[PDB]
Amino acid sequence: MGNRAFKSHHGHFLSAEGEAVKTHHGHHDHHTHFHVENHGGKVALKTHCGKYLSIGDHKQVYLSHHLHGDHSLFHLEHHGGKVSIKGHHHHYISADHHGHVSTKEHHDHDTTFEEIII
Secondary structure (H helix, E strand, O other): OEOOEEEOOOOOEEEEEOOEEEEEOOEOEOOOOOEEEEEOOEEEEEOOOOOEEEEEEOOEEEEEOOOOOOOOOEEEEEEOOEEEEEOOOOOEEEEOHHHOEEEEOOOOOOOOEEEEOO
16 A cells, blocks of 8 residues: 655655656655555556566666566565565565665565655
């Protein structure tokens, strides 16, 4: 159930910017948001009817199209007071503070965000 951004510590949340994706805090102008809607037995991310989260490997990230499966759409779920996002190869999607965004197999805080709305 979501319509905004994923926070990886009070330092910033995954969000949008012009024709690119980044992470930041609310301050200058409206922070362009993300829309999370359902797909099959999991959930997908979209915000322009033409872009879906996507990820390459090792530590590279990008955006693809609508799709049924996993990797492009995702399986994301709450976690006590936080949340976690997950694609194929049983990886979760990561944010290592200022280390930037990537993916990890583990599960704790390094790749678990909180959920901020509108």
